[PDB]
Every structure is written in C-alpha cells, then in structure tokens.
C-alpha cells in the first residue's frame, strides 16, 4: 500500500520455523522407516 506498507518490512519467521521443524521431523521419521527395513 501507500503510507500503510508495513508488510514490506515484515517476515513470518515464526511460521517458517514451524514448517522447517515439521519437515526436519518428517525427514527424520522417513529415514528411520528406510533404515528399519531390516535393521
């Protein structure tokens, strides 16, 4: 917007962290699954 362009200097680092941690966890689980296919 014009004088109300506050969103330009903002970033949702909170969501990014939530998503990043979700991904890291799921990649960790997936890895266990493939490894445990025989121990």
């Amino acid at each position: 917007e014009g004088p109300d362009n506050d969103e330009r200097f903002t970033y949702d680092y909170y969501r990014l962290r939530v998503v990043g941690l979700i991904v890291a966890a799921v990649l960790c689980v997936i890895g266990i699954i493939i490894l445990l296919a025989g121990k």
């Binding site: 680092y13 990014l16 941690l21 966890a25 960790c28 490894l35 025989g38």
Partner: protein, 992 residues
C-alpha cells in the same frame, strides 16, 4: 634378545643316570636333602614364569593424543586460549568465542583419543596361559620320603614322581618308568601318547623317551625323573618367553592411517603458515593473524575422519562376529584382506584332529569311506556279504566305547574311551551299521587276547549271534603282513577260497597304495572254529594258545588318517585363486604332512619334490636339478642346519612348500622368513606350539573349539566354529573394507575445500566471512558422520577375490589420485556452490557482489552502526551480522546439499550408480538424517545463540542444487571414460 630363544635346545639325555646325578648333586633313590633343595631354591630361583613388563594404559592413551591431527587441533585449542588471553588483557571482551572454541577443540582431541585407543587394542595374556600349565603342587622324594610341595619350590636335582592324570612340573630326566605314556602335543601339536622310559632312544632330545617336558601331561602309567630345568629355563618356558616377548609391531592398516595423516598434516601446515605470512604482508594485526590460523587449522583437519575409520572397522567386525569369527583386535579386520601368504598348522587346523577310517580293501577292491565331519560324501558298499564280515570284526575285535551321555551329539564328534585306531573303527561301524553296542550284545565275548607288542595282533572269541549256530567265532586284527601269515582262505564276495599268490600280490598292491596315502593300515581276519572240536562249554585259554591262530580266513584291510576338515580343500583353492601362497608348517611327521598337503591342495597334482624326481627317474637326488621341483618337503632336523639366507632361497624357489616336524621356534623362523621377503603373512593354528608364529604373524587366526587357550591368546582372530571357510570370507571382507575406506575418506576430505576457500577469500578479497569455525565442526562432527560411515556397507564393484593381493609398498589407502579428485575437482565445485549461496543471501538483502570487495573493515567495525548497502540503506552492527550468520547457515546447508551428490559418487570408484544401484539402506538413512540434522540446526529456536545458525528461507535451500547436479554428472561422465578405456589417462589420474 630373543635370538637365543629362536634356536634349538641342548640337553643331557645322553648321560647315564649316575652321571646325571653328579651334574646336579642328587640322589637317584633318596632324592635331595631338605637343606640342599632350599639352597638350590635361593640359588636358581623359583620354578615359575615371570610375565614380561607391559606398557601401562596411561601412556597408551596419551600416545594417541599426539598423532598429527591431534597435534594440529592442540595448536588450535591453545591458539584459541592465546587470542582469548590477549583479549582479556587489552579490550574487555565479554564474549565467549575463543574461550569456548578452545574448550570444544580440546574435547575433540580427547574423544578422538578414545577412538584411536579403542582401535589400537592389544589383548595379550600369553605368559598367563603358560603359567596355567604348571601344576599347583608336585610330588618329590626328599630325604628318602615322598611329599607334595608347591611346584614353584621344585629345583634342578630333586627326584620327582608323576602318574597318569598329572602335569609334568618341570623338565625331567626319566630314571624309572612303568607303562608311562605322555601327551607331547604342547611341543608337536600331536596328542597321540608317547612312551617314556629311562633308555635314551634318539640323539634329538625332543624325540627321545628319557626326557619329559614341562607344559605336557602324563596320560598313563608312572615315572620318576631328575629335574634338569626349572621355570624360564625349561624347553617350553623359553617358548613362553619367546611368545610373550615378541614385539607386536604395526599393522598394514595402521601404517596406511599414519601415511595419510602425514599428507593431510603436510598440506595443513603448508597452507597454515603460507597464509599466516600472507596475512601479515597484507598488514593484518597478530591479533587477527592467529584467529585466521585457528580457522585454517579447523578447515584442514578432518575432525571426524579417524573416528569414522574406527566405526567402519567396528561395523565390519560385527558382521564377522555373526559368522562365528571373533575379532580381538579391530585392525585385524583388514590384515586378512592384505594377506599374501598363509602359514598353516595341519593338526586341528586343516585337519579334524581325529583318526578316521579312510579306505577299506575287501573283494579285491579299494573302497573309500567318507572322512568329513558332517558326512558330505557318499556310500562305498553295503551289499557285499564280505563287508558284513569285516564290519563284524571291526566292532567285535574292539575294546573302545562311547562316553556316557553322548547320544545327543553326532557320532564323529563324541568322546571315546580308547586309543585313536579303535575309536576310528568304532565310529566307522556305528555310522554305517547302527549301534555297535548291539553287535557286542548279540555276540558275547568269552575270551580275548589284547593287542601285544610281541604278538602284533589282537584276537577275540565270541558266541555267534546266529541261532542255527550259536557256536564260537574267532576274530583278530593287527599288522597287515602279520595277519596275512595267518590266513589260508579269503572271504571273496561271500564265499571263501584258497589264498593264491595272485590275491596275495593284490593285497601287497592295496597295502602299498593305502600306505602311500599316508594312512595307517590294519589287517582283519576271522575263523569259524569247528563245532565238534569246540563244545558249547569248551574253555578257551588266553594265556597259552588253546586254539588255532593259523589257517584263518582273511576278510579285508582298513586304512585310517586324521582327515582334512570338509571345507578345507575348497578354502585352500580359494585362497590360491586370490593369489595367496599357502604353506604348511607342522610338528607332524613328513609322510603324513605331505599326504594331507596333496589332500587339501597345498601340493597340486603333478608337482614334485626333488625326492619324487629321483625315485621316478631312479637316479641320485644330487643328479636332480632342484629348479625342476616346484614342491618341497623340509624336515625340521634339516631346517635346523640351514641359515636364514638358505631358508629365503627355499621360500623364493618353491610355490608349494611343506615344513614338517618343525619346533615352535622353527614356525616363528618360517613366518619371519616370509615377512623378510616383504609379504603380509597370516598364521592359522590351534596348539601351544603355534603361539610364537601366531604372535609374529601380521594376523594370527586360532581355532575356537579345538584351539588351546595359549593359541587363542596369541591370535588376533578366533574361528568359534572351526570353520576354515571363514578365512576366505575374512580375506574378502578385508579387501572390501579397504576399498570402502577410500570411498569414505575421499567423501570426508572433499568437504575440506569448501571450508578452506572461504577463509582464503576472506583475506585476499576483504569480504565478510562466508563461513565460521563453529560451522565447520557442525559438518565434520555432525552432518558428514553418518554418510561417511554408510560407505562401509558398500558391496564390491567387481569380483575382489579374482584380483591379486595389494602391494603394501605401492597400493596405498590414500594416494595422489584421491587428493586430486577430492581436493582439486569435486571439493572445488562444492566451494563455488557455497560461495554462490553466500552471494545470493547478501545480494537479496541489499549487498550486491560488486560492493562487497574490501568492505570487511567497515563490516566488522562494531562502532559503525550505519554501513551503506548497494541500495543506499543503513545497517547497524547486529543487523548485518544476522545476515552474515545467515550466510554461514546457508553455506553450511550448501555443503550438505553438495555432499548429497558426493555421497552418491563416492559410492563407486569405477561402476556407475545405474549399475551398482541404491541398495545401501544405511547410506539412504544417512541422506535423510543428514538433512534432518541440518534443518533442525537452522530452524530450532535458540540455535542462533549456541551455534549462530539462522533460519533459512525456502529458496535458500536450492542455491547449491545446480552444483550438486554438476558433481553427479561430472563424476558419472569421468567414470564412464574409465570403463570405456582401461588404458590409463582418466584411470591413472583419478582412479582412487
């Protein structure tokens, strides 16, 4: 020091009984005086063995703390505390950087110390096992009276008494004996009881009957003797010292490790000081000049590599534990793969160590029995009525019996009370005719004449199990020729017939052939006594010939030997196909040694000794060109008068070598001879007479079930099931781990470049620091760990058992070709991918690549809270630093992303991934966990403080992707060239 002990012993068995007493101030009848014995005790010292001085574990741990990488990491750790000290004095720095990094680095050294300490293990209790062979007490005659004393109180000169069941307390001169037999397997590896008597019977004291040795035991009878040697001075006490004293030495794998440590340490100190001066010239304060150096150290040293090696070794040892192959020393996991020569004991190693029936001669025909443990062969005969007649004599004319409670274990494995030949016959009949006890119940023995030294035969009279007869049957066995002189008829295919010169000659032929096979041959015959001349109550006199022992019916011959283990012939061939030379080294007699050599394939068909040529051509042995003989059989008595140079010529000039009737020191000498030629040597054995050789071997392998305690103490590896096929597996595993270590090392080293280059450009370019010191440790200690380990699970790319053993002088674990690829090619591509992401982060935040050159001065200036970017904006100190640390984080993640491809390319040295596939589940696990770790380290809240890791935007992850792919393609194209032309260019330049 031990050169004296490598020599054959000198003795006094040639002296008379009386003469021997003068030498030791002793009485043949009364024995020593209580006072004289105590005097000699203080004089000579105790009848005991002293363990050699060991190196304490303290010094062993700390010796690892100073080996190249640890030295550089120490210099880094201290240089951290240096810069910290210089700070705490000058400008009060409330930070924790240099202090904590110095603590972290010192911990890395200590923990890495534990890994190398675990790898360099030496579990040796040789002298302890020998000490277990000296009895607690001995029986001596002192002041004309026999008393039990502490065996350590035994001295040279006293009168000792032994009987069946006790250990020889010391080396004795036999002066009196009654039916005494002894087990000399300690000195020979052969357990057949040897008679002991006062009479001298051989110039060689190790063969004479009037000497009994410490480390052996009396098996039966009784004997008295004069002690000639005590403690360390006994024949086997010296073997003990020799074995326990032998310098261990460095393994092939250990030598390889130190070698690449020098290389990497070299480049480290090179670039280290090369850029330390390069910085001072650029006008960098010593305050900074050291900080850069610390970074250089951390970049160059692969912090997690030595521990990787250890884990890869451990994991390989775990797989072998699962095939009944115990590894006592982690490094011995690889030595077997580098082995070019095997020196093998025969008895209990190549052989089962059990007299077993091998052949039978009946119906004018040679039949072969199955000698294998698990009976993997086939039948020979069952139909012939002759067989049942021979079978009956083998069962009936036999005094051997199975021990109680064996019905659970297989026939051939069960313990038997009796001599070896009777046990063999027992197990033979029990196997192919069912319960022998049944045959001995159906035919009650009424009278017998046990085998006599003079008679040279054993006879028995039984009540024929037949109801229509129920009469008296006579059976006998003995020396083949003696049995022949007592026969008139031969049971041919059922019916008897006169013994014509024809069949008599066929007997001699059969007899000579079986004997030529190194087999012990016995004759078997029977005689159905006439009914009218022998009533159902007729008494037979065993003392005086009350019955005919002539004109009997010859039934057949039986031959026997201590046979090879089932898997041995095939394992020997497999070793030989892998280009490993196999030598036999045995305490056994030459005829037996040679016969098993041919049986297992040590001596291949057609190959001759000089003696064979001479007999065939009917010419003198001196007339034979010795170069025409590729095979040789050396008796220990001849070995004794040969110099090592002459032993070296024997080793060089023959492909098929048999060393027979060797002493324990002689086995050591042969091993050393092989090593002297530059060969990596394995020893396989099971007896205490293998202990020195096992110790000196680059790798000693002991048998687990049949092995003596001493042998297993002297070994690096134990075959827990006595499965000789495990040697073949071991060499295969050894070769595979050697290749996989290269892959894992290249992989680990490759990521050094993207950690070095940022520090260099930081100096030469004056840009903001692309990657931090902490960030490097997150790679080498964190992300790269599981992937690097996973390479240990790689399958072979080709048939490794088809290639020759590596040349330890030329074929190195880390060579110039590895460095060229890891440092010069792949690592260089990784460095760029790192920098790219760095420029991406900065440029997208407003600092375009052009304006970055020569800005570090203002960038690092803590007091400039207004640096201008390319777009004209102003940044505080902490703001721009957050972007900088975000650059460290994405550079870090870029390494991980480019290591994805590197992990896949390091999978194979030659083959394509499209050929080898992706069947390594540990490797795939590594990829997932590596990426999980990196993501966690970036996105987990609080990690921005502890590790300076900042959250990355999704687009950031993909910066290095095009570089990751170029790596995959590049290496795939390169290896395509290797395969397409075995010529050499790409091969001799980059083929690891």
């Amino acid at each position: 020091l031990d050169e004296l002990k490598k020599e054959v012993s000198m003795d006094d068995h040639k002296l008379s009984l009386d003469e021997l007493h003068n030498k030791y101030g002793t009485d043949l009848t009364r024995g020593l005086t209580n006072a004289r014995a105590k005097e000699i005790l203080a004089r000579d010292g105790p009848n005991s063995l002293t363990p050699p001085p060991t190196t304490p574990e303290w010094i062993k741990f700390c010796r690892q703390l100073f080996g190249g990488f640890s030295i550089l990491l120490w210099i880094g750790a201290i240089l951290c505390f240096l810069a910290y000290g210089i700070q705490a004095a000058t400008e009060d720095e409330p930070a924790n950087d240099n202090l904590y990094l110095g603590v972290v680095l010192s911990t890395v050294v200590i923990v890495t110390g534990c890994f190398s300490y675990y790898q360099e293990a030496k579990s040796s209790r040789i002298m302890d096992s020998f000490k277990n062979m000296v009895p607690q007490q001995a029986l001596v005659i002192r002041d004309g009276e026999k008393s039990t004393i502490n065996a350590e109180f035994v001295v040279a000169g006293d009168l000792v008494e032994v009987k069946g069941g006790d250990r020889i307390p010391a080396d004795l001169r036999i002066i009196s004996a009654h039916g005494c037999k002894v087990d000399n397997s300690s000195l020979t590896g052969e357990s057949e009881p040897q008679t002991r008597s006062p009479e001298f019977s051989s110039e060689n004291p190790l063969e004479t009957r009037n000497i009994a040795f410490f480390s052996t035991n009396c098996v039966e009878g009784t004997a008295r003797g004069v002690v000639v040697y005590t403690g360390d001075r006994t024949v086997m006490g010296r073997i003990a010292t020799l074995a326990s004293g032998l310098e261990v030495g460095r393994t092939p794998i250990a030598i390889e490790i130190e070698h690449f440590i020098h290389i990497i340490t070299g480049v480290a100190v090179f670039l280290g000081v090369s850029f330390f001066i390069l910085s001072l010239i650029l006008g960098y304060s010593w305050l900074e000049a050291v900080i850069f150096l610390i970074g250089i150290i951390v970049a160059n040293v692969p912090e997690g590599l030595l521990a990787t090696v250890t884990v890869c070794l451990t994991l390989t040892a775990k797989r072998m534990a699962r095939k009944n192959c115990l590894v006592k020393n982690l490094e011995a996991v690889e030595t077997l793969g580098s082995t070019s020569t095997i020196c093998s004991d025969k008895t209990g190693t190549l052989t089962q160590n059990r007299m077993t029936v091998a052949h039978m001669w009946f119906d004018n025909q040679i039949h072969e029995a199955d000698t294998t443990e698990n009976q993997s062969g086939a039948a020979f005969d069952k139909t012939s009525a002759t067989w049942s007649a021979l079978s009956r004599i083998a069962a009936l004319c036999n005094r051997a019996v199975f021990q109680a409670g064996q019905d659970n274990v297989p026939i051939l494995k069960r313990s038997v009370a009796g001599d070896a030949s009777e046990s063999a016959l027992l197990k033979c009949i029990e196997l192919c005719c069912g319960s022998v006890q049944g045959m001995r119940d159906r035919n009650p023995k009424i009278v017998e004449i046990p085998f006599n030294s003079t008679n040279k035969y054993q006879l028995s009279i039984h009540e024929n199990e037949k109801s229509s007869e129920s009469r008296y049957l006579l059976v006998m066995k003995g020396a083949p020729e003696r049995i022949l002189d007592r026969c008139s008829t031969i049971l041919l295919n059922g019916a008897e017939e006169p013994l014509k010169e024809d069949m008599k000659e066929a007997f001699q032929n059969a007899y000579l052939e079986l004997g030529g096979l190194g087999e012990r041959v016995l004759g078997f015959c029977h005689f159905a006594l006439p009914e009218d001349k022998y009533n159902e109550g007729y008494p037979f006199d065993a003392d005086e010939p009350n019955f005919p022992t002539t004109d009997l019916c010859f039934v057949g011959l039986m031959a026997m030997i201590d046979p090879p283990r089932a898997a041995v012939p095939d394992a020997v061939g497999k070793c030989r196909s892998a280009g490993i030379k196999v030598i036999m080294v045995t305490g056994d007699h030459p005829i037996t040694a040679k016969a098993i050599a041919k049986g297992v394939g040590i001596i291949s068909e057609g190959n001759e000794t000089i003696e064979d040529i001479a007999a065939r051509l009917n010419i003198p042995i001196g007339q034979v060109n010795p170069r025409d003989a590729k095979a040789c059989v050396v008796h220990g008595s001849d070995l004794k008068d040969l110099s090592t140079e002459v032993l070296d010529d024997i080793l060089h000039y023959h492909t098929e070598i048999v060393f027979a009737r060797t002493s324990p020191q002689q086995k050591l000498i042969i091993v050393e001879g092989c090593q002297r030629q530059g060969a990596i040597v394995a020893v396989t054995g099971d007896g205490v007479n293998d202990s020195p050789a096992l110790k000196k071997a680059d790798i000693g392998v002991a048998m687990g079930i049949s092995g003596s305690d001493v042998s297993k103490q002297a070994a690096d590896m134990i075959l827990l099931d006595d499965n000789f096929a495990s040697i073949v597996t071991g060499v295969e595993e050894g070769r595979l781990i050697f290749d996989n270590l290269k892959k894992s090392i290249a992989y680990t080293l490759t990521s050094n470049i993207p950690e070095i280059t940022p520090f260099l450009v930081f100096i030469i370019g004056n840009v903001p620091l692309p990657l931090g010191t902490v960030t490097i440790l997150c790679i080498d200690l964190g992300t790269d760990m599981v992937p690097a380990i996973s390479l240990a699970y790689e399958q072979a790319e080709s048939d490794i058992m088809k290639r020759q053993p590596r040349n330890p002088k030329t074929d190195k674990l880390v060579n110039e070709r590895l460095i060229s690829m890891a440092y010069g090619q792949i690592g260089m591509i990784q460095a760029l991918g790192g920098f790219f992401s760095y420029f991406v982060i900065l440029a997208e935040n407003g600092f375009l690549p052009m304006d970055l050159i020569g800005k570090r001065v203002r960038w690092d200036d803590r007091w400039i809270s207004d640096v201008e970017d390319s777009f004209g904006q102003q940044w505080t100190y902490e703001q721009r630093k957050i972007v900088e640390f975000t650059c460290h984080t994405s550079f870090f993640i870029s390494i991980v992303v480019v290591q994805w491809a590197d992990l896949i390319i390091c999978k194979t040295r030659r083959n394509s991934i499209f050929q080898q596939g992706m069947k390594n589940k540990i490797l795939i696990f590594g990829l997932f966990e590596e990426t999980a770790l990196a993501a966690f380290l970036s996105y987990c809240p609080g990690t921005d403080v502890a590790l300076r890791m900042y959250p990355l935007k999704p687009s950031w992850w993909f910066c290095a992707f095009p570089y990751s792919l170029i790596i995959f393609l590049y290496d795939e194209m390169r290896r395509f060239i290797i395969r397409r032309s075995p010529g050499g260019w790409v091969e001799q330049e980059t083929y690891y």
